[PDB]
Each structure stands twice: as structure tokens, then as C-alpha cells.
Design an enzyme around this catalytic site. Structure first.
Site, PDB file in Angstrom:
ATOM      1  N   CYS A  14       0.811  -1.199   0.000  1.00 58.53           N
ATOM      2  CA  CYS A  14       0.000   0.000   0.000  1.00 58.53           C
ATOM      3  C   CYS A  14       0.854   1.263   0.000  1.00 58.53           C
ATOM      4  CB  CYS A  14      -0.971  -0.020   1.178  1.00 58.53           C
ATOM      5  SG  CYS A  14      -2.088  -1.438   1.159  1.00 58.53           S
ATOM      6  N   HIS A 119      -5.258   1.272   6.162  1.00 54.10           N
ATOM      7  CA  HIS A 119      -5.520   1.123   4.738  1.00 54.10           C
ATOM      8  C   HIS A 119      -5.484   2.466   4.008  1.00 54.10           C
ATOM      9  CE1 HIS A 119      -6.709  -0.427   1.039  1.00 54.10           C
ATOM     10  NE2 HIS A 119      -7.953   0.000   1.071  1.00 54.10           N
ATOM     11  N   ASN A 134      -7.340   3.559  -5.074  1.00 57.57           N
ATOM     12  CA  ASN A 134      -7.331   2.723  -3.877  1.00 57.57           C
ATOM     13  C   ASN A 134      -6.477   1.482  -4.112  1.00 57.57           C
ATOM     14  OD1 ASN A 134      -8.119   1.422  -1.399  1.00 57.57           O
ATOM     15  ND2 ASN A 134      -9.949   0.577  -2.366  1.00 57.57           N
TER      16      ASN A 134
END
Length: 182
Positions: A14, A119, A134
Site C-alpha cells: 500500500c 488502509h 485505492n
């Protein structure tokens, strides 16, 4: 909608997708994200050396994963904060006492990413509009000027730690060619 440079993430990296989007393009890699993650350790290290170290405390701090990543998924915001700082950017919080209600036009900015717990969600300006990018985003998710103010408001009402990257970004052709939408 033509030149949107979105690094499509497949996996857990991420920090990679967040930064390779945030900077308007691919600039960082997993090991490198761990390398920049280490700069927090040594920066806070020097910070402590500027005043706040007994003796063992120095080592008692360095024996810690200070920003150091192991699980390549739940990167903490510090990695985007520093990675931009080393590029000449600043990173503000959008939930700060002042910054949360000071009325910063999200559409006026160049890029800001939000983190829900662990996240990441990337918000970058392209052209006259903004796009959500995302971890598992099929790509760019459109967000109208006003829907941005909506997005951000929902974030703070939902539990999103938003972070407004401030400064000059590596402008990609996507921003120039986003005058064409759908």
C-alpha cells in the site's frame, strides 16, 4: 481520462501504490519504501540526539522498528509524510484542530491521501478534477469538485485520517489531459 498514471496495486504494498500515485507517478519501490521508512528511525534518532537522551535510551529507541516495515501492507502514514519531505513536499493532517475546520479547498490542492486505520486511499488532482485511487481500485475513480468536499467530509465522519500533501508535485501529463472526462 487518457493519461491518468495510476499504478495499479495487486498485493499488499500500500505504501507503493499510495506513493506511486500520490507523486503523480511511479517513484518508489518496496525495498525503497523500507529504506525511506528507516529514515524516520535515524531522523528521530538525531532528533533525540538534539536533546532528550539519557544514555541507554538512545539504543532502547533504536532497538525498535521506527517506521521500519515488515508486513508490506499496513504501512503507517509516516512513510508518505517523509517520502514527500525528502522530495521537497510537506504533509498536513486534515483532522487537525485547526486544519479540520479551517476551510481548506480540497479541490485547490494538488494531492492528499487518506488512511483508514491501516488502509490507504490516494486522492490526486488531475486537470480540473480529482480521482480516488485505492489499493484494489480498478483504476481512477472520478470525484467532482463538489463531491471532493463530500468525500473529505465523509472521511472524517467515517473514521478516515486524511493527509494533505502541500507543495510542488511532479506534474504528469494526466493533469493536462484531464480536461476530457467521459
Amino acid at each position: 481520462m487518457e493519461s491518468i498514471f495510476h499504478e495499479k496495486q495487486e498485493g499488499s504494498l500500500c505504501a507503493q501504490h499510495c506513493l506511486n500515485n500520490l507523486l503523480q507517478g511511479e517513484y518508489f519501490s518496496p525495498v525503497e519504501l523500507s529504506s525511506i521508512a528507516h529514515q524516520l528511525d535515524e531522523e528521530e534518532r538525531m532528533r533525540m540526539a538534539e536533546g532528550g537522551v539519557t544514555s541507554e535510551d538512545y539504543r532502547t529507541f533504536l532497538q525498535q522498528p521506527s517506521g521500519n516495515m515488515d508486513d508490506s501492507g499496513f504501512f503507517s502514514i509516516q512513510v508518505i509524510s517523509n517520502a514527500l519531505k525528502v522530495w521537497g513536499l510537506e504533509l498536513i493532517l486534515f483532522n487537525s484542530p485547526e486544519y479540520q475546520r479551517l476551510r481548506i479547498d480540497p479541490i485547490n490542492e494538488r494531492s492528499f491521501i487518506c488512511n483508514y486505520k491501516e488502509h490507504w486511499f490516494t486522492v490526486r488532482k488531475l486537470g480540473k478534477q480529482w480521482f480516488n485511487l485505492n489499493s484494489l481500485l480498478t483504476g481512477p475513480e472520478l470525484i467532482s469538485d463538489t463531491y471532493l468536499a463530500l468525500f473529505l467530509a465523509q472521511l472524517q465522519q467515517e473514521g478516515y485520517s486524511i493527509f494533505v500533501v502541500k507543495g510542488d508535485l511532479p506534474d504528469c501529463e494526466a493533469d493536462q489531459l484531464l480536461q476530457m472526462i467521459r
